[model samples]
Target chain A: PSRKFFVGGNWKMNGRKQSLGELIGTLNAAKVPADTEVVCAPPTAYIDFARQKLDPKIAVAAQNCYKVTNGAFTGEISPGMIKDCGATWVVLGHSERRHVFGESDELIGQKVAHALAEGLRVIACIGEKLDEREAGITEKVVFEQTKVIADNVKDWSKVVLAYEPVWAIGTGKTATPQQAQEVHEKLRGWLKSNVSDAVAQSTRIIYGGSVTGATCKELASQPDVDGFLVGGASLKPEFVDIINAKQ
Target chain B: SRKFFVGGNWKMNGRKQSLGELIGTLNAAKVPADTEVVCAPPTAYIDFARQKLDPKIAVAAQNCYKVTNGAFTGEISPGMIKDCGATWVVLGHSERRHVFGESDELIGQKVAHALAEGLRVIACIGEKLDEREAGITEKVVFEQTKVIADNVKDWSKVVLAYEPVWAIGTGKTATPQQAQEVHEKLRGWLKSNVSDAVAQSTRIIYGGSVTGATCKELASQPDVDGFLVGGASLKPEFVDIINAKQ
Candidate 1:
């Protein structure tokens, strides 16, 4: 059985109407490899606009979601509403949300569980901080995050795990291929030990954090590295090349 | 007289799906024929809210930019708001002012810009708890009104929302007497500063912790023309507050 290579671009709080058209045009014109699954997560303001502009083959993901269906939560995007608005996928528990916004593991779990219940596919993010990595507690930090979701989500088919090391995200420092692969291999091992064999073999664990077109191929070549979640480079033209990295 | 306008300020809350059903319920409810109703939702839900809302009721944006259009990122402009079919824009809300650091000068700019773009303005003004304790409530509110009076040429297009910063979302409410004293002072200030005709015509509305239980007495104030409701606006009781004067 083959798990298709998946590459997602999280545009996080970026883009305007003019820039949106150009980005969509660039993506549409590029020859994406048939084997890769490409998804672009734009800001909430442009979800419907992007839906109208993007090609049928490409999918859209909301940058975030509120745990509840609706009511009184200020400045929050809801999963149920995103689903209602015709979006099929959403990214939850990003590091910005985890660290900057003070979202605990329990809150992330609630979002994951709620998003899954609403029938929207999730790209759930889990990562270790620079300090944790320095102390050699990277595996410990990642395991706890993964374990929360695994324990809560019975059917992990719709979930994509994006292992973004916090140190590399927008910091201009990327984890070397060896470092990323070592963590990826350990994650696969933990999946085998804790979850079903099918889940261990089938789940697509992607790398994120400062992934540029130059380094994507090496990272993609790792035995356990299934794909990537390109951040800053995703907004650039080279994102198309990163999408076709496996080819 | 347009039966004392009442608006539910659903500030930064609700999504498209739930907002549809909420508006639908309002449409189905027994609304007073004379009272005009409006709800301010988040930017993403504004278009959906406008399409689903009944003709009798109107839609409002919680906040809008000072410019008609430009390069200010993550901001929804007044022109874009008008393009979305929204007729009303709530400006100078205490949350936008105190929490978000929007100053009187900026609010004055927004009021001028919004009015120039042909959108009605709910210009919010109020004093904090400290200002009230210092016995300078009337002085503080007068300065806020002065900024609008200086910039706004057409008083007919504006509604004043007298929301005391101390009372908003704190579960503590301004007593009807306290609200009336402030409302009376504001009306008197409008009369002296602008003109008698303008003062008589414009609506000086109250906001901050307004609920169904407290609305009737506040609505009884001759100078208090309407309400800009907060927390209770999300509930069914919002309908009651809208018809408070009726």
Candidate 2:
């Protein structure tokens, strides 16, 4: 696959300046795989600090953003504001944003479209809940979510697909290697038929939800699993190990 | 009735360059000595706003999470807001309530958390157009305020802002009489439910389409202690509103 390994760390609503400062120091000194595309998403309040402190080789992303450039929407940060902080990427449609915060697929799609329109890269996420998977409609749910995201993308090159199963997130439940690959491969096939063959071949489809150093290698070995979008493990030193997992 | 307070809710606006310019304008503007001014920049710029603006003009976050820290994505915590040098937060803004679907229970949780975390809160309450049209404006506003009031242990750290939802960002403002009517009723609610001292001391501000044009008349109303400026807060005219009492 021509898609470079892309690993993203979502710090979520975690970290203060001192702890994040320490984590950035470690990330700057770590020797990462040259071909790996690395990004860390800090909480919005820390985006400017992260962008300034972290090594430029490791990009910074805002965990989420609003659909518009500027408005009277209280408590929302815009994609324009995210880029103004010098962060180049944003994670849209995370399961936490979906279920916990009650963001709809339409809203997430609007965020993705606006972020891309504002010249920022996007980590567009789509996934099914455990109950949906148990009901045996994982593909239906994921594809519907993806279709909303795909409908908004004019240039797939600026977007990275992250398949984060809702049940696995923060539950200490990582999708098994085969479990992850089945979805990744099918997603790639969906892209091939829906979008062009080139996009299908080149677009990176990363797995997320409780990804850690111990589980990274086998997941990386899966041909369709391009990399990961990490959660809790991103705060620790082993995140470096996860970055070099493809080796 | 108390020291006049004016707060600027910048909402989801301003970037580094533009905000720097606004900060410069605010720092240089001749604000009234009797007025207390606070600016609520978007959460991402709170630190920068606090650092750049003159000390007299305090910085506030548009919103914050109920907890000190958590896994809630896209939400900033109260402690983080304080750590960034902001001492005030605007909770339960109509946008947070209506636009984002934050429940009254959730907003009350935020008010309690923010105060406990040592940040003063601009606790917001208001009625929608339909509620007002149905002649139950008092009922709607009172219920919202009661939830916020229930969460408070220290009235000294709270500022009650009554922003009528229909007027916010709609270019339609409640007339000075209309504003005074609600503020009076709200102060009465506080007097009867809480205490006479609390009602007498608390500053009940009006929000929703406040501008330099209408501020002087609004400021003259006895119950209308001050204002929470929205879209006009970003303009140079905000300085005029700050000095309205003069």
Candidate 3:
């Protein structure tokens, strides 16, 4: 089976309700590739609104979710809740959640497990920090993060793995297609060995980190680089072009 | 009879454009004739939500600082929430207590301040998994309610949501028996601590994993007056959850 090209926009902690109409209109009118699957993870507040505003073809995703179904965990959304609101996807273990919110891999793994059980698709994020890259432990770090989810989620059909190098994100430092392809190949091999051969070949492994509309086509050309998880560019009209990069 | 008190905690979600549509959806919704529907938009959209919504569907604030109004940047006060035309305020939501570090004392102060300003209160209280595992659910919930009861003289203005933290958004629902057990305990506590009239008059609602499918069974419980719906409330099914009693 061939992997479908996927592009996701994570509009983190940005945009007001007033401006969302323009953004949604832009996304709706964009020339997205029919073969590509597109989704956007806005802040929790915008999930329902985005769902209503954006075309149904472009699915909506939540930035994060609680491991538990419900209770006193304030300022956090839950997988069950997201599903209830008609959201189909969730982005877990983003670097912001890891570095800023202090989420451990274990917590992210639990979130992924719960999100799957709730029947919501997941964009499971994994990446290495600047120090780990300098120390040449990129593979080790990414593998560890992926391993946690792979261990918990017996079925990898609904999971989309996003490889975002922390240093490159929002830093104007795009990963070279060579560097990204190397990691993607390594990840495929690891999945083959650790999960199942089908999962290894079928999972869509995307790159994230200062990905621009101008550079997306080059990154999308790599056989192993399935798509992208865009950050800053997601807020701009260029996000439409990025969605159609595979075209 | 008192207006079928209803409030929506649009928790930390929505943008300006979407807010208009959401308000429009609520306006177009077949709201219960006797019910008072209120939507609690985030701080930024409080005024915006209010402006778009019909007069019948009042607006509320998801949270507010205890202080009436002052120098806390990015923080809206109870007075501010009221001034913005929101008649209701939700305090001590599990998220506010556990995730954002709100203490019972602080929540109580906020309840008092919001009440003093003539805004209604939805005083949320719930127990976490570990606390339930230890079988101290009543003890945990009672302590939380006591803090607010102790601070505010009148219970008439408060709507208690017995949201078990363990059951929230996790899809791990507390069985009706489990929820009724706690709601009963809360009612008894109110009778002994406040008064029988207050206990009977107060509306103690259920929250957490309250989908349309499960709401009817949970609503059948005598003590489960209504719901403080989390996720399901955002959808059209929310109308069913609201009219569960009908």
Q: Give me the candidate number with maximum DockQ.
A: 2
Residue-wise lDDT of candidate 2 within B1-246, one digit each (tens)? 499999999999999999999999999998888999999998778878898999999999999898887778788998888878899999999988998899999999999999999999999999888788899999998998899989998999999999888765466667889989999999999999999999999999998667788889899999998999998999898998998899
- Candidate 1: docking tier: incorrect
lDDT comparing candidate 2 with the true structure: 0.90
> Cα lDDT of model 1 overall?
0.80
Which window of ten consecutive residues has the lowest lDDT sum in model 2 chain B? B166-175
Clashing pairs in 1: none
For residues A106-181, write the lDDT of model 3, one tens digit per residue. Answer: 8889989988998989999889887788898998899999899898786688899998878665556557778888
CAPRI-style grade of the A/B interface in model 2: high
Model 3 CA lDDT for position A47: 70
lDDT (10s digit) by residue, model 1, range A107-181: 889888888988989898899988788898999999999998787676788999989889765566667898888
Question: Candidate order by DockQ, highest to lowest?
Answer: 2, 1, 3
Candidate with top lDDT is 2
Task: Give one digit per residue, the lDDT tens place, for model 2 in A1-247.
Answer: 5889999998888888999999999999999889999999998888988998999899999999999999989889998888889999999998889988899999999988899999999999889887898899999999999999999999999999999888665556657789999999999999999988999999999998667788889999999999999988899999999999988
Looking at candidate 1, what is the lDDT of residue B80? 66
Tell me the spans in candidate 1 whose CA falls farther than 4 Å from its real position.
Answer: A170-172, B1-6, B10-38, B50-216, B222-226, B230-246
| Each prediction's DockQ against the real complex | 0.19, 0.83, 0.08
- The best-first sequence of candidates by lDDT reads 2, 1, 3
TM-score of each: 0.70, 0.98, 0.59
Q: List the residue pairs that clash in candidate 2.
A: none
lDDT of 1 by residue, B1-246 (tens): 635889888865666656676788888877787677778876567667887888787888777767754323234567766766788888888877775467888888888888998888888899998888899988899999999888789887888999888775566667888888898999899889889888888889988667888888888888888899877777788888987876
- Model 3 alpha-carbon miss at residue A133, Å: 1.8
Question: Whose DockQ is higher: candidate 1's or candidate 3's?
Answer: 1
